[PDB]
Design an enzyme around this catalytic site. Structure first.
Site, mmCIF file in Angstrom:
data_model
loop_
_atom_site.group_PDB
_atom_site.id
_atom_site.type_symbol
_atom_site.label_atom_id
_atom_site.label_comp_id
_atom_site.label_asym_id
_atom_site.label_seq_id
_atom_site.Cartn_x
_atom_site.Cartn_y
_atom_site.Cartn_z
ATOM 1 N N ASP A 29 7.310 7.938 -7.966
ATOM 2 C CA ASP A 29 6.206 8.797 -7.468
ATOM 3 C C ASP A 29 6.531 10.285 -7.362
ATOM 4 O OD1 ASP A 29 4.509 6.423 -7.103
ATOM 5 O OD2 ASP A 29 6.001 5.961 -5.587
ATOM 6 N N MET A 86 9.174 -2.888 -10.478
ATOM 7 C CA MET A 86 10.531 -3.043 -9.959
ATOM 8 C C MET A 86 10.573 -4.278 -9.041
ATOM 9 S SD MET A 86 12.235 -0.434 -11.380
ATOM 10 C CE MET A 86 13.543 0.113 -10.301
ATOM 11 N N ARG A 135 12.073 5.213 0.847
ATOM 12 C CA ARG A 135 10.787 4.502 0.700
ATOM 13 C C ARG A 135 10.192 4.757 -0.697
ATOM 14 N NH1 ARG A 135 10.125 8.777 4.158
ATOM 15 N NH2 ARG A 135 8.992 10.471 3.118
ATOM 16 N N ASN A 136 10.554 5.878 -1.335
ATOM 17 C CA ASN A 136 10.032 6.246 -2.657
ATOM 18 C C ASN A 136 11.047 6.066 -3.771
ATOM 19 O OD1 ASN A 136 7.440 6.784 -1.561
ATOM 20 N ND2 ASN A 136 8.014 8.871 -1.084
ATOM 21 N N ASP A 187 8.764 14.393 -2.563
ATOM 22 C CA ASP A 187 8.769 13.350 -1.533
ATOM 23 C C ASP A 187 9.880 12.345 -1.774
ATOM 24 O OD1 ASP A 187 8.165 11.855 0.769
ATOM 25 O OD2 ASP A 187 6.126 11.387 0.172
ATOM 26 N N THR A 208 0.840 -1.190 0.000
ATOM 27 C CA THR A 208 0.000 0.000 0.000
ATOM 28 C C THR A 208 0.872 1.235 0.000
ATOM 29 O OG1 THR A 208 -0.289 -0.031 2.410
ATOM 30 C CG2 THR A 208 -2.025 -1.086 1.120
HETATM 31 C C1 LIG Z 1 8.833 0.307 0.771
HETATM 32 C C2 LIG Z 1 8.078 -0.971 0.708
HETATM 33 C C3 LIG Z 1 7.745 -1.667 -0.584
HETATM 34 O O1 LIG Z 1 8.563 -2.501 -0.996
HETATM 35 N N1 LIG Z 1 6.622 -1.392 -1.315
HETATM 36 C C4 LIG Z 1 5.638 -0.391 -0.871
HETATM 37 C C5 LIG Z 1 6.375 -2.183 -2.532
HETATM 38 C C6 LIG Z 1 7.057 -1.586 -3.778
HETATM 39 O O2 LIG Z 1 6.296 -2.174 -4.849
HETATM 40 C C7 LIG Z 1 6.371 -1.579 -6.103
HETATM 41 C C8 LIG Z 1 7.101 -2.249 -7.095
HETATM 42 N N2 LIG Z 1 7.748 -3.391 -6.775
HETATM 43 N N3 LIG Z 1 7.201 -1.703 -8.339
HETATM 44 C C9 LIG Z 1 6.526 -0.566 -8.646
HETATM 45 N N4 LIG Z 1 5.766 0.079 -7.720
HETATM 46 C C10 LIG Z 1 5.646 -0.409 -6.445
HETATM 47 C C11 LIG Z 1 4.820 0.305 -5.413
HETATM 48 C C12 LIG Z 1 3.991 -0.503 -4.599
HETATM 49 C C13 LIG Z 1 3.271 0.029 -3.522
HETATM 50 F F1 LIG Z 1 2.463 -0.760 -2.816
HETATM 51 C C14 LIG Z 1 3.305 1.409 -3.287
HETATM 52 C C15 LIG Z 1 4.071 2.234 -4.143
HETATM 53 N N5 LIG Z 1 4.076 3.609 -3.820
HETATM 54 C C16 LIG Z 1 3.015 4.423 -3.982
HETATM 55 O O3 LIG Z 1 1.980 4.091 -4.555
HETATM 56 C C17 LIG Z 1 3.154 5.840 -3.483
HETATM 57 C C18 LIG Z 1 3.869 6.104 -2.299
HETATM 58 C C19 LIG Z 1 4.037 7.426 -1.856
HETATM 59 C C20 LIG Z 1 3.460 8.497 -2.565
HETATM 60 C C21 LIG Z 1 3.598 9.954 -2.083
HETATM 61 C C22 LIG Z 1 2.651 11.087 -2.549
HETATM 62 C C23 LIG Z 1 4.072 10.968 -3.151
HETATM 63 C C24 LIG Z 1 2.706 8.222 -3.736
HETATM 64 C C25 LIG Z 1 2.576 6.904 -4.200
HETATM 65 F F2 LIG Z 1 1.880 6.654 -5.309
HETATM 66 C C26 LIG Z 1 4.903 1.700 -5.142
HETATM 67 C C27 LIG Z 1 5.789 2.648 -5.965
#
Ligand SMILES: *CCC(=O)N(C)CCOc1c(N)ncnc1-c1cc(F)cc(NC(=O)c2ccc(C3CC3)cc2F)c1C
Ligand code: NA
Length: 266
Positions: free
Chosen positions: A147, A85, A133-134, A129, A18
């Site tokens: 993001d 990713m 984490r991003n 941001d 999430t």
């Molecule tokens: C840090 C923990 C983790 O590993 N996560 C959350 C999973 C990453 O998964 C992922 C992969 N493998 N590839 C592409 N994208 C994602 C992804 C998955 C996820 F559940 C969340 C997110 N991030 C968001 O949706 C997100 C986070 C923060 C913000 C802030 C306003 C700017 C926006 C946003 F859309 C990702 C990238």
């Protein structure tokens, strides 16, 4: 051929976690291409504002950016389709493999992010941001920035307000905290904190302080200490990001040149 994606071309395979807009799933586009599918939770986003500016974000193209593939907007909830990713977010990757990371790999991570940010800087496009984490890690260990600019469309007062519990205080310079003055120099500050997160192997910055205590101590001149794995040259680089005066902070072009100098020296 169009930024509007047909949801019938998407296959939902596994939940990735999430984010700020809710559930994100791993899937396939036309059964072959790997994708991440953000399922935008109702009331979590200023959807009309996002859709109106989406084309600018779509046109951002660089190898070190997590690519925005398109959107599914002729429905509710709307979807954001992005590059997938395999190794997830950088923060968790650092924590998971903590005592197996070598200094050359940590520098390479900083370089990957810095190249992405140098590109965003040249486009006058703010991340807003930037943090471990991003950032995401692919199957080849390449770090990409994720993001960028999505911060602008968040509907959640806890996240958008500087006095909110989800606001990224620990990655924010004083001019963002006090004046809401975002610029490429506020991304520079966040990048310095990100370098610290990398070299500290995913430690929380200013862990002994609350968000309010962090803002206070930083305003009084306190800075993050040098992580154990960071050399004097690496600390000089991240430290340069935290100048009290935004105009005295380097650009991402200068930071990248300094990172490449450290790489060539070792
Ligand atoms: C840090 C923990 C983790 O590993 N996560 C959350 C999973 C990453 O998964 C992922 C992969 N493998 N590839 C592409 N994208 C994602 C992804 C998955 C996820 F559940 C969340 C997110 N991030 C968001 O949706 C997100 C986070 C923060 C913000 C802030 C306003 C700017 C926006 C946003 F859309 C990702 C990238
Ligand atoms: Na040391």
């Amino acid at each position: 051929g169009s930024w509007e994606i047909d949801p019938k071309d998407l296959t939902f395979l596994k939940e990735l976690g999430t984010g700020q807009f809710g559930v994100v799933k791993y899937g396939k586009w036309r059964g072959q291409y790997d994708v991440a599918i953000k399922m935008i939770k109702e009331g979590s986003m200023s959807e009309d504002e996002f859709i109106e500016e989406a084309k600018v974000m779509m046109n951002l193209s660089h190898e070190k950016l997590v690519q925005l593939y398109g959107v599914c907007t002729k429905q509710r909830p709307i979807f954001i389709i992005t590059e997938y990713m395999a190794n997830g977010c950088l923060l968790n990757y650092l924590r998971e493999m903590r005592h197996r990371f070598q200094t050359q790999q940590l520098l390479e991570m900083c370089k990957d992010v810095c190249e992405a940010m140098e590109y965003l800087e040249s486009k006058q496009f703010l991340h807003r941001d930037l943090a471990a984490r991003n950032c995401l890690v692919n199957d080849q260990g390449v770090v990409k920035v994720s993001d960028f600019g999505l911060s602008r469309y968040v509907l959640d007062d806890e996240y958008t307000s500087s006095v909110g519990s989800k606001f990224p205080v620990r990655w924010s310079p004083p001019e963002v905290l006090m004046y809401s003055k975002f610029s490429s120099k506020s991304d520079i500050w966040a990048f310095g904190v990100l370098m610290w997160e990398i070299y500290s192997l995913g430690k929380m910055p200013y862990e002994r302080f609350t968000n309010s205590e962090t803002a206070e101590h930083i305003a009084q001149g306190l800075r993050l200490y040098r992580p154990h794995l960071a050399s004097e040259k690496v600390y000089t680089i991240m430290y340069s990001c935290w100048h009290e005066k935004a105009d005295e902070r380097p650009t991402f072009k200068i930071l990248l040149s300094n990172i490449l100098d450290v790489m060539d020296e070792e």
